Amino acid sequence: NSPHELKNAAQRAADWLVERQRPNGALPSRTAVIESCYKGMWALHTAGHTQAASAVADYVTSLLQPDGDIPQPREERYFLDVHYLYANGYLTIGAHVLGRFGLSRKLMSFVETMRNPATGGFRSHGPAIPGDGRCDSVSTSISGLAALYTGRVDTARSAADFLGSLWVGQPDRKNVFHAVADASGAVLTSDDAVAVQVRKAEGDWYFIGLPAFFLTALYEATEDRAYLDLATDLMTYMDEDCDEDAFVDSSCGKAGVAAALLYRLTGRPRYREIAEGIGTLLCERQSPYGYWSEEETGDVADLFWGDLDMTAEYVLWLDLIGRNLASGERVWAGK
Amino acid sequence: NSPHELKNAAQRAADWLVERQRPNGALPSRTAVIESCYKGMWALHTAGHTQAASAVADYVTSLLQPDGDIPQPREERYFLDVHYLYANGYLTIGAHVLGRFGLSRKLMSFVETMRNPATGGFRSHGPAIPGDGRCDSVSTSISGLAALYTGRVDTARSAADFLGSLWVGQPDRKNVFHAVADASGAVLTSDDAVAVQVRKAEGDWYFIGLPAFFLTALYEATEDRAYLDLATDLMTYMDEDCDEDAFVDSSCGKAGVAAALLYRLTGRPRYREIAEGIGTLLCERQSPYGYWSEEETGDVADLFWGDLDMTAEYVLWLDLIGRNLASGERVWAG
Questions:
Q1: Cα(B60)–Cα(B25) distance, rounded to whole angstroms?
Q2: Where do the domains of chain A lie?
Q3: B187 to chain A, closest Cα gap in Å
Q4: CB of A23 within 8 Å of any CB in chain B?
Q5: What are the strands, taking DSSP E only, across chain A?
Q6: B101 to chain A: which residues are within 8 Å by CB?
Q7: Nearest Cα to B216, choosing from B123, B86, B321, B96?
Q8: Which of A179, A240, A260, B41 could be disulfide-bonded to A137 (CB atoms 3.0-4.6 Å)?
């Protein structure tokens, strides 16, 4: 599959979302929750649907609290005490690229209140959510990326320090990737902490792919070779040590974008194969109507919140893979 | 007409630009200069043509100097010693929204070196270009917008300080808007400086509209009332004191975006009138072939650099006006 066809698949899903966008700007979710449209602003903006993206911004602004958070509506536990800031991250990036500087500043300011200044990580649970102050690789990676987009590179650099200490302190990485560390920085190995079975096809690969993507973007922002080495170390960790599911499961989109980005930066052919093989897989899973779903195949007017979030998510990654694959070809053709 | 038609008109020109893009990412310009595609990254990104916008980013990157500037290829006088940073400003914004953080950081860093720390304005003439250290409203506004997009809010605020001092220091604003200040920060009334004939229909209105756009965006970022009042003061200054050409001239696009953004922020219907009239007028002037041009009317495969920049510019403003008019209705029409 070529970058042109990856983009065509993203444009079809974007057209599907815009055609069924609610009058208040919310995306057609069967449950009114923030976890169903938190990627909506960024995804629809890269697809050219700026009026639909601005509509999501109006819906998101109506949910904003004076402290800069959107604690409600939230139902999924993973957006409560696993990676609470996962929604806030995309909301910050989407608002900032749209020019909603007031929305992005307020969102990014609350995200900074959840940063652990000792470790550089971000708290896994939101305010008034019971927790122990643990920090995970997903909340930290998406917060560092939001800091990159909002121009707060010290926050992003601090986020990479948490990812570097988390990768170094893995107790046995060949079997389990522990993506959580406690408030003091010790890698959390308890049963209630998120752990990726790297030798099993059980998903949760975005706990490793998102760090690889953020660190690759931070390297491009800074050209600090430590961020590139850690990004390539995680890409090698997923390509050779991890299960084949790491590049097949629905959560493999972050690893595909990191591979496409790394291809444009380094020019290595293997990173092109990873991005091409992932973008091809996502194009085949797409329903004929445009959306993506685990079980739905009908000409529906709405989707389960997870299917809608995945639909907007694949608009982003397919666009991001395609523009980096195409740019990487022009840059490294004969050079 | 409607926010949709404004968006459809922008998509037509964006498809036209992508249709004739050169393999190196450069836009179809008759002369290969940076002033023919500096708006390309931002305009094509907002139109969904991310692969073509990224191709422009590859072309711009190959022209990037170690200091973060693109001094060549340049030829037009206005991009040399009138507002040299006009190209650099759109390059920084377009690179940052695309995620080219290394390209945006290097461009924003050179722009900061062009800042006058004593006044907040940005030097009008680039390095090795003869000049007297003057700073204009266009260079200061677009550099402040780039600082806004790159998160350097202190630089953006310092740009608004220069614009406020330039507005207060006007010795005769009823007939002329001196858009240039000297190195010391005083309004420059020299005959060779940029001065808009305000009571006359003689263009150059973007020396006022772009400050109004930047200040409105800085108000949204900070909600500091001083940035709003100065933006409405410039909007009122353009609406009543200035000639009708302030909203009819080809350089009225920046004022149209400022009006649409002010309409979403304040809800006052006159701002929707100004933006809807400019957006409608821009669709009227669009050549049914897709591009914009002052004279050309054929099925050409390339454009004069001034028309190619106008084509990318109107893709940006029509999209910005359309999505700020549509969002303002949802917020205020209830």
A1: 8
A2: 3-332
A3: 30
A4: yes
A5: 135-136, 176-178, 180-181, 195-197
A6: 148, 217-218, 220-221
A7: B321
A8: A179
